[PDB]
Design a protein around this ligand. Sequence first.
Ligand code: HEA
Ligand code: HEA
Ligand SMILES: CCCCCCCC/C=C/CCCCCCCC(=O)OC[C@H](COP(=O)(O)OCCN)OC(=O)CCCCCCC/C=C/CCCCCCCC
Ligand SMILES: [O-][O-]
Ligand SMILES: [Cu+2]
Ligand SMILES: [K+]
Ligand SMILES: [Zn+2]
Ligand SMILES: [Zn+2]
Lengths: 47, 180, 121, 99, 91, 90, 107, 186, 459
Amino acid sequence: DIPWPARTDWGGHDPATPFAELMINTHSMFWPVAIFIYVSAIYMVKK
Amino acid sequence: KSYYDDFKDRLKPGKYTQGRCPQSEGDYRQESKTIGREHLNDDGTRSKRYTVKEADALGYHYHPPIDKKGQVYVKGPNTVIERGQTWIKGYELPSMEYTYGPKQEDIPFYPRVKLNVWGNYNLVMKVEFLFFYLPTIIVFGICIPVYTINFAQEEVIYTTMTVKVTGRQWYWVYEVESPT
Amino acid sequence: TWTEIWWEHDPTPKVAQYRPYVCTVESGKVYWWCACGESKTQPWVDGHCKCSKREGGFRPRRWEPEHDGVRLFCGCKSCFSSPTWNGGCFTKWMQSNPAGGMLYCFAAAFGFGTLTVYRKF
Amino acid sequence: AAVRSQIEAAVYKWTRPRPPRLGVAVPRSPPGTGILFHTNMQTIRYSLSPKVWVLVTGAALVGVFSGQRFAQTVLLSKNPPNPPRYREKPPVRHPHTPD
Amino acid sequence: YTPSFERGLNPELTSGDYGDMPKPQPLIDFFTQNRNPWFGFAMFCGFNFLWWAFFGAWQIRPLWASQRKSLAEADRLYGPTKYGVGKKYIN
Amino acid sequence: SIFTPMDWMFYYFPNYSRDKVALMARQIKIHFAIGFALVFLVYHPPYKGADYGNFHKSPLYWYKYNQLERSGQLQENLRIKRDWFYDEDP
Amino acid sequence: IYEGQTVQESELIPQEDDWVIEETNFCLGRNCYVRFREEDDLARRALHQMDSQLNKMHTRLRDGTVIPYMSFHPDEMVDRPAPIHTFSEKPLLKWTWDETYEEAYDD
Amino acid sequence: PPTRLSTPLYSEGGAFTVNWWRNRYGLYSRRQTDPMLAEFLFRQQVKEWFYDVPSYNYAALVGLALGILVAVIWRHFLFNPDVYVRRQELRKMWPDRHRQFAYAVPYLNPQLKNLLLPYKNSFIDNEPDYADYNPVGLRPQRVMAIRRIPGFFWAIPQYFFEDPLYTSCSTKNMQTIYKKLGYSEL
Amino acid sequence: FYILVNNNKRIGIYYIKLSIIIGILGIVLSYIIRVELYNSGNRIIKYDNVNYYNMVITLHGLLMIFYIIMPGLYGGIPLYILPILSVITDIVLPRINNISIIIVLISYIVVINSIVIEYNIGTGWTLYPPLSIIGTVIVNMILYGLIIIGISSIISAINFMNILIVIDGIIYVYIWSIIITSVLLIISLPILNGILLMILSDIYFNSIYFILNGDVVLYQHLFWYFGHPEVYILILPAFGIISIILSVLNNKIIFGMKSMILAIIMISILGSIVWAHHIYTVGLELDTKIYFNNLTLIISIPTGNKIYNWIILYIGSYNILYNGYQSLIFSIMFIIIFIIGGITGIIISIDIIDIGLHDTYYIVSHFHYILSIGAVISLLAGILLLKDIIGYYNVIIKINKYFGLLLFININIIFTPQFIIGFNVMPRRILEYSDNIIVWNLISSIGSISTILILLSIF
Ligand code: HEA
Ligand code: HEA
Ligand SMILES: CCCCCCCC/C=C/CCCCCCCC(=O)OC[C@H](COP(=O)(O)OCCN)OC(=O)CCCCCCC/C=C/CCCCCCCC
Ligand SMILES: [O-][O-]
Ligand SMILES: [Cu+2]
Ligand SMILES: [K+]
Ligand SMILES: [Zn+2]
Ligand SMILES: [Zn+2]
C-alpha cells in the first residue's frame, strides 16, 4: 500500500492483486539463481 | 639499510616555490643570449619563437637535412675485430643507480620461467563449452517463465467495470460510470 | 602434490610444522625464510640447514615487510604465498592425514551451515 | 584411540595417490636425473590428490547440510496456528473525513 | 609487549640461536597485533562500521529513546492491531 | 550440431568436418532453421494447445500420486481446510 | 591451445652430471622515479630519460645471448614517455614457416 | 590443419567452403602480394578462426538469434491485424475493414499462449485461477496445470496434488467463503 | 603549438584532460542531486525553482554519457595507444583527429552557456516528446550540442575503421573492441540524427509528428535504437582495456582470444536488436515484448563468456609479483562490480519484473554500477597502466590502497541503497519523496559527500 521506513522489501511488498503476487514470485524465483551466478564467479577471483 | 641515504647528497632541497625566482629578479620569459641556445629561454624551456612564431613546419628557417647524395649522418657501431672475426659490442645502459639513485645491491631474485599456460586441451575445451552453455541453460530456464508471465498480463478477462484515467499537467482526471 | 606425483626435479621440503609461525617483523629489515624445514631457528634460516648451505636446490627465501606488525609464516614449506601463510599448512596436512582433514572440514561446514541457516531461515 | 588410529591408517593407505595420466604430450625424463631446479622458482600451488579432495569436499557437504538440519530442528521453531480471526468493529470514521 | 616464545609442534626446530631474528610467538599476538592500542581502536572501528552497514549505527539509540517511546505508545493505542510477537515491532 | 562440443564433432566425424568453413556454415544454417521453426511451429499455430484434458502425466507423476493415494495423504491434501471466513468467538 | 614448445627426451640429456638450472636473476634492479640532475638542461634531461628505459634492458645468459625485456603488445616498446615519432622503422613481426628455396643455400 | 603449403586443403563444393573463402578473403588485402605469402596468410586465418572449437558456439548463437528475429518480423507483417502493407482497408473507415478483422481472433490465440497460460499456478499463491472463466468465447476456457513449471520453481511442490493448501486457495473456495458472507459475487 | 597539434598521442591526452574538466561539472551536479535527496523538504533548491532540478538531472546524464565517459574511453585511451598497438607511425586521418576534439569542446561550451543564459528547465537525458518539444530554448541549445557531438563521434569512428587498411601487426582484442564500437556508431548515429531532426522540426519548424494522430512512441523507438547501442559503445572499450591489463599484469596470454573477439562481435549484433526493453511499459504487443525479452536475455551468454575468460587470466598468476597496484585492483574490481550491474540488468529484463521496477531508482543503481563504478574504474585503470607511457605525475594514485578501498566502499554506499528503494518504491527524476524513504536516501547521500572527499586525496 504505502512505503514504510527502513524496509528492504526485496522483490516487492503488500500485493493486493493476483498479478502483484506474480511479480513478487517471479523475482523470488530468479533471486537464488542470481546469487549462484554471483557466488560461483566471485569465489574464483584470486591468484 | 636505508637506500635513500645513498643518494641523499644528489638531492639538494630547493629554495624557490616551483623552482623559479620572481620574474623581476630574473626574466625567464626572454630568450637566452648564450651562443647555441637561441632556441631556448633563459630557464631552459623552448622559446615561443622557436616553436610557434617561427616554427620550421610553417616554412621558417628552411634547411633541408639530406645532402646531395641522399645521405644523412649515421653513427657506426663499436666494432672490435678478434679471433679472425669482426664483432660488434652492444651499448649497455648505465647502472640504474646513476639514473634512478638506489644502489643496485641486495636485489630480490626473480628466476626465469616460461609463460604460465593452461594445459590439457581436452579439459580446457570442456571448460570453454561450459563457460558458454551453462549461461545458455540458465537463459533457457528463464525463457518458459518469461513466456507464461507475459501471456498472463495479456489475458482476455471478463471485466465488468471500466475506469478511464487521463494524465494532465499536473493532476490525474478519472472518469467513472455513474449508478443509474 | 606437484613434487610428490607430478614432477621429480624440484626440491621437496620437509614439513617443520603443520601450523604457521607467528613472528613480529619490522619495516626496512630483510628476513630469510627456511625452505627446507630443517632449520632450528624456524621460521628463519639458521646458517646450518640445506638453505644456508645451498644444498640440493634449497635456497633462503628473501622477504621484507611493508609495515611493522605481526605476520604469519609458513611452517609446511609449501604454501602458495610462502614465506607468508595463506592456509596451505592445513591443506598439506589434510593430504597427509585425510581422515583428520574430513573431521575438521565437517566441523567447519557444520558450524557454517548452522549459523547461516539460523540467521536467514 | 585404537579405532581412531585404525581408521586413520585405513583411510591414509587408500588415498595415497597414483601417478597422473598426463593429458599432455611431454617427454620422459632421462633416467637418473635428480633435482635440477631450486626453491626460488615461482611457487607452484600444493594441490590435493583427487581422492583426498573428494573425501574432504564430501565431508564439507555432509557437514553444511547436517548443520542446516540441526538449526532447523533445534534452534528454529515452527509457526503456531494463526490466532482466531474474530469479527471486530472498524473505526466509525476515517480520521480525514470532513465534519 | 615483550611477547612470549612459543616453541611450536616440533620444539627441536625452534631450539637454535635466533640472535637478532625474531622468535615465534603465540597466535593471540597476531590477533591483537602485539596489543597495539591503535589496532584495538581500529578493530573496534571495524566492528562499528560493520554494525552501521548491516543493522544501523545503534549509537543514535540513546538519543532516540524518548522518541521511540512515543512511537511505541502511538502504535499500541491508535495503530492497527498487532498479534502475538508482532506486538514487539513498531514502525 | 546442437549442444555439441565441436571437439567431439571433429574427432568422431572427421570426414564430415574436413572442410571447417563449410562446417561453420552448416552450424549457422541449422540453428537459423531451428529458431525460424520455433516461431512458426511452436508459437504461431493458431487454435492449438488448448487440450487441457490431455495434460501429460509422466511416470514420476504416477509414482508420487499412487504413493499418496495408498495412504490418506492424497485425500487429506485435496480436502478443503477452511471454507468459512470468521471463527466463532466464545 | 598453446602449451609450450615440444621437447624430445634426447634434448633433455645433459653433457655433464653436474648440470643444473642456471640461477640468473631476472629482476632488472631497484628503480624509482627517474631522478634528473638540476644542472642538466632540457636536452641533457632528455638524454637522461633515454638512458633509463627498462625496455632497453636485458639479461645475459651463460652463453652470451641475452633475453630482452619482452611484452605481449607493442605499447611497451616505445620510449617512456612516448616520443612524438615512435615507429620510424616499421616494427617487424617475424613469422616462421618450413618453406625454403634453393637460392638461399650454397654447396 | 596442415603446416606445409605443399599439402592441399580439402574443400567442399558450394557457396561457403574453403575454396569459396580463399577466392574472397584477399580481395581487399594489401598483404597477399604473391602466391606463397597469400596462401600462408590464408591458412593462418583459417587455422585461427575455423579450427577454434569455441568459435562454433557463437555461430550457433547468431543463427538462433537471427532466425528468431527474421521470423518475428515476418510474422508481424503476415499475420498481425494492426500491420498494414496493402491499402484497400486503409481507404475505408474502421467499421468497414472486414478483411483485416479476419486476422484478429486467429492472431489472439497462438499455440504457446494456450500451452503456457495453465501454468500461472506456479507464480500465484492465492486464486491462480481468478481469470480462468470467461463466458464470451474469444479465448479458450483455462484449466490450471497439474505440475510446476520445469526449472527453478523449487519453492513449490513438483505436483500440486502434493501441496496441502492448494485446493483451499482456489477462486472457487474463496468465492464460497465470500458468498457465504454476502460480501461479493466473485 | 597547442590547438594546431595533429599528433594522435597529444590529442589522446586532450581527450582525457577535457573529460576530467567536464567531469568536474558532472560530479558537481551529482552532488546537488544527492544533497537535495538527503531528506524530505527543500534543502538547496526552492520549490519555485524545481525546474532547476529537472535541468540538473538532465545535464548530469547527458554530460557524463556524451562529454565525459565516451570522450574518455572512446576518444582518450583509443587515440593514444591504438596506433601503437597497430604498429603504425600515426593515426590514418591526422586533420580529422584534430577537429574532433575541438568539436567536443565547442559543443560543451554551447551546453554550459545555455545553462547561464537560457531559462533552466529539464526533460531528462532521453528528451522524450511532447515534453521536450513544449520547452524553452535551452532544449534547442542541447539539441545543437548533441548533433555537433554526433559529428565528432562519427568522424572518429571513420578514423578508427581505417586502421584495418594500415594495421601492420595482429588485430589484438582491444583493437577489435574499438573497431566494433566504431561499427556500432556508424550504424546507430544516422538513425539518431534523423529522430533528433524531427524533434527540431517540431520545436522550430511547426512540424506535427509529436501531436495527436502522430505517435509519440515513434521517438522512443528511434531514440532507443541508438540508446542501447550507446550503452555498449560505452562499455566495449572498457572491456578491451580490462583484457590488456589482466594479461599484462599477470604475465598471462589471453585465454580464448578468438572467443573474446567473437563475444564482442556477438554483443554488438545483439545490442543492435534489443532496444525495446526500454519501452516495456508503453503497451507494445505481446509478441514484440516476448521477442525483445528473449533476445535481451541472450546477451548474457556472450557477456558471460568474457567474464569467465577474465577470471582465469587472474587465476594462477605468480604470487611473488605485488598485487596491490591500483591498476590491477581496479581491473579486478571491474569483474566484481560488472557482475552486479549485469545481473540486475537481467532482473529488469523480465518485463513483468520491469513493470514494478521501471522509472525507479533500481534502474539508476543498475546503470551506475556499470558506468559510474565500472566504466570509471576501467578508464582509471587504463590510464594508470599507461602512466609511464603517458608520463603524468604530481598525483598519488599508482600505489594507493586507501583510495581504492575508500572508493569501493563509499561508491557502494551510494548505489546499493538505491536498489532497496526500487521496491519501496521511490520513482526516478523526482526531488521530493515520502518521509518513509528518508533512511535509505540519507545513507546514499552520506556516501556521495564521502566519495567527493576521497577525490581530493589523490593530489
Ligand atoms: C554501459 C552501461 C550499461 C550496460 C552494460 C547495460 C547492460 C544491460 N542492461 Fe542496461 N541500462 C543502462 C546501461 C547499461 N545497461 C542505462 C544507462 C539504462 C537506463 C537508461 C534510461 O532508462 O534512461 C539501462 C536500462 C536498462 C533497462 C531498462 C529498465 C527500465 O527501463 O525499467 C533494462 C531492462 O531490460 C536493461 C537491461 C540490461 C541488460 C539485460 C544488460 C546486459 O548487458 C547485462 C549482461 C551482463 C550480465 C548478465 C552479467 C555477466 C554475465 C554473466 C555473469 C553470465 C551468467 C549470467 C546469466 C546467465 C544471466 N538496461
Ligand atoms: C557515466 C555517466 C555517469 C556517471 C559517472 C554518474 C555518476 C554519478 N551519478 Fe549519475 N546518472 C547518469 C550518469 C552518470 N552518473 C545518468 C545517465 C542518469 C540519468 C539521467 C536522468 O535521469 O535523466 C544519472 C542519474 C543520477 C541520479 C538520479 C537523479 C534523478 O534523475 O532523480 C543520481 C542521484 O541519485 C546520480 C548520482 C550520481 C553520483 C552520486 C555519481 C558519481 O559522482 C558517484 C561517485 C563517482 C565519482 C565522483 C567518480 C566519477 C569520475 C569521473 C566520471 C571522471 C572520470 C574521468 C577520467 C577517469 C579521466 N546520477
Ligand atoms: C522489380 C520488378 C517490379 C516490382 C514491383 C514491386 C512493387 C511493390 C513493392 C512493395 C514492397 C515489397 C513487398 C510487396 C508485398 C506484396 C504482397 C503484399 O501485399 O503483402 C502484404 C503483406 C501483409 O499485407 P496486409 O494484408 O495488408 O496485412 C495483413 C495483416 N498483417 O505484407 C507483406 O508481406 C509485405 C511486407 C513485408 C516485406 C518483407 C518480408 C517480411 C519479412 C522481412 C524480414 C526482415 C528481416 C531480415 C530478413 C532477411 C532474409 C530472411
Ligand atoms: O540499456 O541497457
Ligand atoms: Cu538498453
Ligand atoms: K528533498
Ligand atoms: Zn632450510
Ligand atoms: Zn604452509
